[model samples]
Target chain A: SKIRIGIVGYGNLGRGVEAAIQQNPDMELVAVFTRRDPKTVAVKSNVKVLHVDDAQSYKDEIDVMILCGGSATDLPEQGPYFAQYFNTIDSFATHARIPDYFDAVNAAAEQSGKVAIISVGWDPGLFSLNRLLGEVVLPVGNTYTFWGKGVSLGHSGAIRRIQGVKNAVQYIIPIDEAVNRVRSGENPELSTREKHAMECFVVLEEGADPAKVEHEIKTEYDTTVHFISEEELKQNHSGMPNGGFVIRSGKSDEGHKQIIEFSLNLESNPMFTSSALVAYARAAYRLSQNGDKGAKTVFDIPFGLLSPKSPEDLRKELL
Target chain B: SKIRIGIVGYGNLGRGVEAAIQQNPDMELVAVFTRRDPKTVAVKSNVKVLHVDDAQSYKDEIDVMILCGGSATDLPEQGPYFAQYFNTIDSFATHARIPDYFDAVNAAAEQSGKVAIISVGWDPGLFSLNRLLGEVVLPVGNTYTFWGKGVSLGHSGAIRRIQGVKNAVQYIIPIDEAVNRVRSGENPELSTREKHAMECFVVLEEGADPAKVEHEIKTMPNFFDEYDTTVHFISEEELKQNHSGMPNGGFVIRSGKSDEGHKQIIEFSLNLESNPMFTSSALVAYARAAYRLSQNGDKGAKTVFDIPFGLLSPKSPEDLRKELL
Candidate 1:
């Protein structure tokens, strides 16, 4: 039976999930449950559209509900809330807050006897798995993740919240020389913002003073902020670009150094995130069918379960 | 109930399996099977001694059977033979023949509705999982397996076949320079002989000529000539004194470029005290897994990669969730 996929929150990530579902043969888009009125929203697919209020009633029909929302505010609430009724997967990418988020979702999913997989986008999803695998394979190792030289969603989100800012986008670009230095066995101690700079392109409110808005953003983030029209913002920075490297360096023994690195140069952040999220949806479905119910992070799921292929087929091909 | 472990082929490895059961309280040694007369074979464990042909009689009693036979001659036939009666596992060390070995075992196991796990010792067991995982986690990478500054069971098994050789041990030592080149992001395509050399320490029978033994070992068809073959004709007591302690371990490395072509490498390594005990321990764990998998209605031959990590561990799924998961 094809796993029925219900998407919550029709954002870029949700659209990405819908697009990803179109490509996968094992899954079907059951519905897109949005907080907005079903009549007001327009999606490309002829897939059913429903209000968030009616989501709980359709629990039996939908096998896995993918919470496609921002990690900042929407996921922390929606993840635990929806987990009670469905095998939920969320790309809640707050690295430091994952344990707390997991605990909240765990309590809900455990009581409901459902599987909940948290933090499953590319950075928190694919990179997270690779990071743990590299470390496990090479026990004595140091893990280093270099996120982007690409668009910064968190920084842009923070900017949009600023007064007189209608919309915003930020790019955190890595210094090419610093990247070269680290890649050349430098192992240099580089800080988070040390190797990169945050550049913001802001869309200002009609009556808002540009000087005041620019100074306010600079005072808060100490980043380079430039105000532009909504048209210019749409024309120049339409895509969400992201990528990075998770490099592990250690040794089997002294002088026998080993390095495990996993990196992704994703052209479309939303599509890459959706592709990974879609894969985990398969994992969650399998986990539930196997009579196992619990809340797990990207790390807890079996390596084989994530794929749509059978275990026998994977061994024959992979081995 | 404790898992009932049946031992096959009462050789050194077979004894190792019995002793391993004694160490773990959750499992019990059922009996040891031997090719010789059961009365003549005295094993260390205070367990039943049964003839190999009599093994099928106790199929219902034993939960899992650990095949401790040689990969060269024994496991290729015996793995398939006993698997029909009981869930079986073997430390079949022949890497080249595993596909065929697995096929034979799979044909027998699947037909009889049993689970069989083959080639289950450290190299094929632990290292195999790491290699597959490294490549999966990083798809655009090269896999390199460095086996031993320790004993080579397969290579040593190759040596033991010659008529003059009473006992033999072959050590394949990795070239330090080659290892350095690999670690430095070079990822060069190195041949088996280029990366490693074979060192054979053999004990010949008194009547055997030393010259004939050396020539036979050095001019061997397969991997021996591929190496800078060094054949040392040693005394029996001398071989025991130095080479008795089985110290074998190496690395499985995957090297490639990361995001934007950043060099990355992931490697898994093992250091073992002796092959007998460690490989036996791995065999026991895999034996339990075959039993569990078979109980769950799975059949055919499985590898380290096919089985789940939860089945092998003592912990339940809930416990794994609370702790390790």
Candidate 2:
């Protein structure tokens, strides 16, 4: 018999995982968890629905556990609460978990010698890994450019949690100037969409890598939430000279030089986020099954396999 | 004896006025008014300095008055007050208070028989008059556009008053959605300078005279006191769907036959205000003399030389035009 997988949480992302496991030849979904009467979805997936409280009731029957549980971090008692569900699972993959909680989950998995991966959404997931891994051959010196997008109406609780926080953005700047003309009570006329820009310098300390020395860096955005206030933004928008930035670098020791450029479309964050998350989930599953099983962070992943893949493998196989 | 001009507040504008009066042969500035020692500026202009309050001492010594007493509304009171100065003077001109107090000042001038012209700056002064006059033939209908570029520091007082209130720009319905997308919120990604295009429809009730059409419309700057005149007039072609037709030199336009088309721009405003204010001063003095010679039943207070061309002959023989004769 194939490894029986008990999938918890039947939201959109949960349903997605359920559909994935059903299609996979290597795994079989024994049971599903949801607060709703999963009558309609259960008919389509041909899986048994059970209350989450009874998760441990059938924990022994399944060999691997995939927690598609809704995010309940803000709630006191509700969380991955992964410990309460699995006692002897051989493998585990959760849709969400805290940073420090990663250690506790990993430690618990070490007992059963089961594989575990936390936070499967795009940014903190494979994109983060690909970026960290690209630093090896790419020689990421100063600026690190991250691009992500997601599109969902918060129909699924899991997707909602991922979709909402993805909207929050932050930037670094030099000494903050109190010279904001808008905040200083000047009748400032502003443009339609608010835009913000900042300057950040990466000064290498004593134990540094000189090989990563890169030149000027810049950023781009089409649509985004504006800064809170003029006083809130530290540096001028579009850097000092204006627009974005330019960089000059080489890939190989050969005379042929390559100009690798990066830009972001701030307009469609949701679309980008969803595309990235789907790509990440597939990469994470592939990495765990075929590659290293140790505790790996998103920064430890590679960049080439970042965001350009669809979630369904059959769609690719048929195409 | 020269006209004793009292510059109660001597700044760049004040010093410029004093220099101008010294250059004019018909005008000799006798005494100047200042809060500081007039001995410094008086050396250059050949005039004695008098305290603002002590300006009345020479009330009987001067002829005409040009009060560069700052933009304060209660300025007429600084130099023995307008009531007393009206009795002692023949004519005067200041920057503002021209239109609002026109009827009363003209009446007071009619009583004391003196000239008083206000709001000598363009836009409110000459541009306002020119737009009103130009509406006679080619009135802007279904379209109006103004384009300009320049930087100016606005008045501190005006800046303080509009600080919080003006920042909240209200958008009207779906059209404003695009405009708001360009210039709202805290750190706007766009630049401070903005380009604007506006369209207004004068739905005439059956028959509205083309002459009277221009009177109902007016244009004002987004910010006050930040004086700018980029000279380039908004071209007519910018209003239509495509601007590619007028490929010769200027921005082209091809509005349908239903709407009339016209375009013009004022390039040099700061320079014009400098010359026009003096020319207007002459116009005001002449108008005052005309008002005194006429009766109260005069129909309209109209433009310059509205009288017969012969009756409008120059008082200075050198300026009389033989062509006009």
Candidate 3:
């Protein structure tokens, strides 16, 4: 018998995962759960609809539970769905970054003897893992700041939600060591204000490294005004505008001031993200294969379980 | 001899009035005032710039005074201006509807034995006159609601000034009916909650005729939203998205039984306010004529002048509109 996989929430990542699964001779797509019937999305993926409660009937038949739907925090209503099939759920992965719904996921996964991975996409997934690994090997100071800007490609609901809430704003600051100081949990000399994301300025005091930290155009709209018109205004497709920048600045009393800038675009992101997800998904798969039980985000995984690499290198290796 | 008229504030209505004045040989454009004299505007009008102070300094030279400026509720600043040419300001007209400025204007006119008309605009001047006359003759029963919308057009500062001040709203309720049921003066409503304008519903047992009441809708936007046009309708079902009144609703009505069928709707809306300065100036012109001294001592601090019915049917159409709507 072949290893059967079923995904929920047939969105962008789901389509990519389905394509990847079809590449494997041993893996078979059983069904996908969605609010709309499979016929509506029939052109994208060929999968049967499994009723919400009917998952139990085929629990024994399916080996892996690739819940592309979302993390518990991303959708609180999905709690009962996870709880219902707790024991049968094997491998779970999500695109949520925060530990907001950790308790619920941990409760179910611990009981069911499954491994749950969160923030298994883009920044918090591959980027976070890569940055964490670099910090371990490289000599890092106490101060740090991770700031970038890019036009938003899609996900309008997320932006609208942020805008409706009071005190949501964007900021314009240069990349410097002061930002690092603020990120390092040290009290800085500037007042803190909450934008779309809460931000604070951190400056090193007299006894400290004397370094400052900040980012360029680190505000919301400045980073997300990705809309543009092409041709006669009718022939354009929306994509993340231009590119984003990540600059890390550091300095010491010895005149060891250095600024490292990392600028990249989303050109090869579709392939890079697919490879990144699979690399992450495989780790969770291994945990489930070993019968491990727990809710874990990228940082929670044993550092040695997966090797960190650039998204480009990851894509190259997948090829 | 023709009237030598100078125009100020070359805004929309000022230009219109200037065009009319130019076509008529009886009016001569001696000067015009603008923050900066646009070359094209000056050439087209063939009018010279009169230094702001020079016009009033030589007020005696001109037969009529036309101040093409909007209304100002505050009269303190205008008090000095009116006083400068008090004697020579035999006839004063402002283009916009002015309220608080009247006190100083009236005082200056009385002291100089001159005439000053505060509001010469159409709505507040002519329309207000008609409304006052109608109320006197109609014997209004009650006002269900007062509505106004789209008061944002023409007047540029209307939104910013009207932002949170709801009391600026006006109403046409009965003058003295509230004394019996409610307090003698305007108290917070007893059974209802409305803080905008004055809302006074009539007190009638059983029921009253709908034709005897008054109602209105005011759809003016706050300082932030652009003032387009605010419209009103007679029935509740007519309230459609973007078709009428403010997003927030305000109502004033006489206390009555909900089960009764005596409800009526009254509405008032302004799309684009005409240039207030032009109208205000015209008003001062007529008011100076109508407000002639009936009896000097009798017309005390606050005096209401009787309208000379002759002004309504003057030989000129301009005098007709000034006296009647």
- Among the numbered candidates, top lDDT falls to 1
The numbered model that scores best in DockQ is 1
Off by over 4 Å in 2: A1-319, B1-8, B35-43, B73-80, B86-99, B103-108, B139-151, B155-319, B323-325
Window of ten residues with lowest summed lDDT in model 3 chain B: B257-266
Per-residue lDDT of B1-325 in model 2, one digit per residue for the tens? 3233444445533554554453333445566667676555454466677765676676666544444554444344533354244322212233244333344444455455443433332233323322322221112211111221111223212222331221111111112332334222121232223223222212233343433432222223454212221111122343233322111000101111101111121111111112322332333233333333233333222222122111222232112111110
After superposition, the stretches of candidate 3 with alpha carbons farther than 4 Å from their true spots are A1-3, A22-26, A70-74, A83-97, A142-155, A158-234, A240-264, A268-274, A302-319, B1-325
Between candidates 1 and 3, name the one with more favorable lDDT. 1
Q: After superposing the true interface residues, what Cα RMSD does each candidate give?
A: 7.8, 36.4, 38.8
List TM-score per model, in order.
0.61, 0.29, 0.34
- Residue-wise lDDT of candidate 2 within A179-217, one digit each (tens)? 132222232343322223332222333443333322212
Candidate 1 vs candidate 3: the DockQ winner is 1
**lDDT of all predictions:** 0.76, 0.33, 0.37
The residue-level lDDT of candidate 3 at A169 comes to 22
Candidate 1 TM-score, true structure as reference: 0.61
Candidate 3 residue lDDT tens string, B228-252: 2222112323223222321111122
| Residue-level lDDT tens digits of model 1 in A1-319 | 8999999999988887887786567789999999999999998787889999999999999999999988876988899899999999888888777777888999999999999998887667666655544443344446666667678878888889988999999997766665655544455677766677779999988889899888778872227887888999999898776777666654432223344445555556776677667778888998899887768876566656766666666555444
